[PDB]
Design an enzyme around this catalytic site. Structure first.
Site, PDB file in Angstrom:
ATOM      1  N   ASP A  59       0.826  -1.197   0.000  1.00 19.89           N
ATOM      2  CA  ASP A  59       0.000   0.000   0.000  1.00 19.89           C
ATOM      3  C   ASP A  59       0.869   1.259   0.000  1.00 19.89           C
ATOM      4  O   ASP A  59       1.838   1.278   0.748  1.00 19.89           O
ATOM      5  CB  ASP A  59      -0.900   0.115   1.227  1.00 19.89           C
TER       6      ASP A  59
ATOM      7  N   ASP B 103      -0.738  -3.230  -4.319  1.00 21.83           N
ATOM      8  CA  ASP B 103      -1.927  -3.194  -3.468  1.00 21.83           C
ATOM      9  C   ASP B 103      -2.605  -1.838  -3.595  1.00 21.83           C
ATOM     10  O   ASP B 103      -2.335  -1.128  -4.574  1.00 21.83           O
ATOM     11  CB  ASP B 103      -1.511  -3.555  -2.040  1.00 21.83           C
ATOM     12  N   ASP B 104      -3.464  -1.460  -2.666  1.00 18.56           N
ATOM     13  CA  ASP B 104      -4.175  -0.191  -2.736  1.00 18.56           C
ATOM     14  C   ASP B 104      -3.238   0.983  -2.986  1.00 18.56           C
ATOM     15  O   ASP B 104      -2.169   1.097  -2.389  1.00 18.56           O
ATOM     16  CB  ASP B 104      -4.945   0.070  -1.440  1.00 18.56           C
TER      17      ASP B 104
ATOM     18  N   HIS C  83      -4.220  -1.887  -6.451  1.00 21.80           N
ATOM     19  CA  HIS C  83      -5.593  -2.384  -6.336  1.00 21.80           C
ATOM     20  C   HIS C  83      -6.612  -1.256  -6.305  1.00 21.80           C
ATOM     21  O   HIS C  83      -7.792  -1.486  -6.009  1.00 21.80           O
ATOM     22  CB  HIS C  83      -5.731  -3.274  -5.094  1.00 21.80           C
TER      23      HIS C  83
ATOM     24  N   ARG D  81     -13.063   1.886  -5.617  1.00 23.23           N
ATOM     25  CA  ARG D  81     -13.481   0.842  -4.688  1.00 23.23           C
ATOM     26  C   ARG D  81     -13.826   1.362  -3.291  1.00 23.23           C
ATOM     27  O   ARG D  81     -13.100   2.114  -2.650  1.00 23.23           O
ATOM     28  CB  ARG D  81     -12.419  -0.249  -4.509  1.00 23.23           C
TER      29      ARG D  81
ATOM     30  N   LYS E  34     -14.855  -0.668   0.130  1.00 20.51           N
ATOM     31  CA  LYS E  34     -14.995  -1.987   0.754  1.00 20.51           C
ATOM     32  C   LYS E  34     -15.349  -1.831   2.223  1.00 20.51           C
ATOM     33  O   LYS E  34     -14.582  -1.218   2.974  1.00 20.51           O
ATOM     34  CB  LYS E  34     -13.717  -2.809   0.607  1.00 20.51           C
TER      35      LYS E  34
END
Ligand SMILES: *[C@@H]1O[C@H](CO)[C@@H](O[C@@H]2O[C@H](CO)[C@@H](O[C@H]3O[C@H](CO)[C@@H](O)[C@H](O)[C@@H]3O)[C@H](O)[C@H]2NC(C)=O)[C@H](O)[C@H]1NC(C)=O
Ligand SMILES: *[C@H]1O[C@H](CO)[C@@H](O)[C@H](O)[C@@H]1O
Ligand SMILES: *[C@H]1O[C@H](CO)[C@@H](O)[C@H](O)[C@@H]1O
Ligand SMILES: *[C@H]1O[C@H](CO)[C@@H](O)[C@H](O)[C@@H]1O
Ligand SMILES: *[C@H]1O[C@H](CO)[C@@H](O)[C@H](O)[C@@H]1O
Ligand SMILES: *[C@H]1O[C@H](CO)[C@@H](O)[C@H](O)[C@@H]1O
Ligand SMILES: *[C@H]1O[C@H](CO)[C@@H](O)[C@H](O)[C@@H]1O
Ligand SMILES: *[C@H]1O[C@H](CO)[C@@H](O)[C@H](O)[C@@H]1O
Ligand SMILES: *[C@H]1O[C@H](CO)[C@@H](O)[C@H](O)[C@@H]1O
Ligand SMILES: *[C@H]1O[C@H](CO)[C@@H](O)[C@H](O)[C@@H]1O
Ligand SMILES: *[C@H]1O[C@H](CO)[C@@H](O)[C@H](O)[C@@H]1O
Length: 339
Positions: free
Chosen positions: A159, A180-181, A202, A235, A237
């Site tokens: 991240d 990742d993010d 991500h 996104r 979540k």
């Protein structure tokens, strides 16, 4: 107005020992001993920190952080030509922070007030890079994170910016290559991200939300940014079977290029997508404005997994995402939005 320079293998030591005597501290080619933190904690109000040459860290299985800064009215910058090199491939083993080697977190930006971080070039982090927490009126400007080496080298959970328990955090001009993010907002208020370039990771996500100390996300804006060659674009979540709040979240003028899995994805059953989404973390006042781009053919354009009544007041204007399949599995989609 004092100025101090620390360099080499004992720089970290001297730095930690004399930081409250230096209005400006210049770190030149500092090599941080293995298993220790560059402790920039509790600086005097107004301190300036300049990163110069190449900063390196000794190798060891631990949890970090490699660097830690805290304090008020701070200015921290990267000199032209500098770099702060994690050489993360010493740790990458495909298992990230969920197994294998214990890998250290990179940068603890905790308890910062009225402060700026800009121009920092970070290369090959072992695992997550920026941990932002309990900070107020923090600016992260022109940050470059290049973990591109991790793409086929076992980099996981890298991240770029993890945010929580903080307010008035601004992130502008970030360039990120990771796994990742690109951004993950776990909690906080009045957050603003603009002019970013997010590659290989991500996506730009709100969350995961719920199951923590602070489960509130409010007034978050992503604008004028590109997400490219990533698993997801937009996104949200929220953790299944948790409580919390997500509201006043805007994505505006977003470009999606070659998104592999989901162009837009909202899941209120995050943590177990085989289960019905739960209703404890409502998402209200979600605005998409001029989000556009491409999804690959084996991907999904839009997936919305909302619980009954837990998603409402969504304004979606000029959303044009295509190339992937259209999901037949969206649930409880707010009116005005669609899959
Ligand atoms: C939602 O979050 C927005 C982004 O954080 C927020 O806008 C930002 O508001 C702050 C504070 O009002 C502005 O900063 C000001 O205060 C400091 C302290 O002296 C000054 O240094 C600044 O120059 C300025 O006066 C930001 O400028 C502003 N950012 C944006 C992008 O305009 C909104 O106010 C929040 N909206 C709601 C409804 O809460
Ligand atoms: C510490 O020493 C270095 C070496 O000249 C300088 O760049 C710095 O400004 C401070 O004097
Ligand atoms: C790195 O640079 C600083 C500059 O002051 C020295 O103090 C140190 O000995 C090393 O040469
Ligand atoms: C200073 O000393 C450290 C540890 O002894 C080295 O890692 C560094 O390269 C420099 O020689
Ligand atoms: C690191 O090296 C410095 C030298 O100034 C010491 O003061 C410190 O305690 C640690 O040994
Ligand atoms: C760190 O730096 C200080 C001076 O900058 C030294 O006194 C110490 O020995 C260590 O090299
Ligand atoms: C950084 O390191 C110095 C000694 O190396 C300490 O005095 C300081 O409190 C911090 O641990
Ligand atoms: C920390 O670094 C400063 C640099 O001026 C020294 O004055 C002090 O002795 C310590 O090594
Ligand atoms: C600049 O600030 C440092 C501490 O931040 C002081 O040691 C110095 O005297 C000057 O005020
Ligand atoms: C130490 O040096 C920096 C840059 O030279 C200043 O911005 C700071 O105010 C202090 O003079
Ligand atoms: C990290 O590993 C180094 C080996 O380079 C040691 O010097 C240090 O004590 C720590 O265990």
């Amino acid at each position: 107005a004092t100025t101090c320079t620390f360099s080499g293998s004992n720089g970290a030591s001297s730095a930690s020992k004399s930081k409250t005597s230096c209005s400006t501290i210049v770190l030149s080619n500092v090599a941080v001993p293995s298993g220790t933190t560059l402790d920039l904690t509790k600086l005097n109000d107004g301190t300036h920190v300049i990163f110069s040459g190449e900063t390196t860290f000794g190798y060891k299985e631990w949890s970090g952080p490699l660097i830690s800064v805290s304090g008020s009215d701070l200015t921290i910058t990267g000199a032209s030509g500098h770099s702060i090199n994690g050489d993360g491939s010493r740790w990458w083993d495909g298992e990230g922070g969920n197994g294998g080697k214990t890998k250290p977190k990179f940068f603890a930006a905790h308890s910062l007030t009225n402060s700026v971080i800009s121009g920092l070039k970070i290369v090959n982090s072992p695992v997550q890079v920026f941990s932002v927490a309990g900070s107020d009126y923090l600016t992260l400007k022109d940050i470059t994170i290049d973990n591109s080496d991790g793409d086929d080298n076992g980099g996981h959970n890298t991240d770029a910016f993890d945010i929580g328990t903080s307010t008035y955090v601004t992130i502008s001009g970030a360039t990120v290559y990771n796994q990742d993010d690109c951004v993950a907002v776990n909690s906080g208020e009045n957050i603003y991200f603009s002019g970013g370039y997010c590659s290989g990771g991500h996506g730009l996500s709100i969350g995961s939300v719920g199951g923590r100390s602070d489960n509130t996300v409010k007034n978050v804006t992503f604008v004028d940014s590109t997400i490219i060659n990533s698993d997801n674009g937009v996104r949200i979540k929220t953790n299944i079977d948790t409580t919390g709040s997500v509201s006043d979240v805007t994505y505006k003028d977003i470009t999606l290029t070659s998104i592999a899995k989901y162009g837009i994805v909202v899941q209120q059953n995050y943590g177990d997508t085989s289960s019905t989404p739960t209703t404890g973390v409502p998402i209200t006042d979600f605005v998409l404005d001029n989000v556009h781009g491409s999804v690959v053919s084996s991907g999904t354009n839009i997936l919305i997994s909302c619980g009954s009544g837990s998603c409402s007041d969504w304004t979606w204007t000029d959303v044009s995402v295509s190339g992937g399949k259209t999901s037949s599995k969206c649930t409880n989609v707010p009116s005005g939005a669609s899959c």
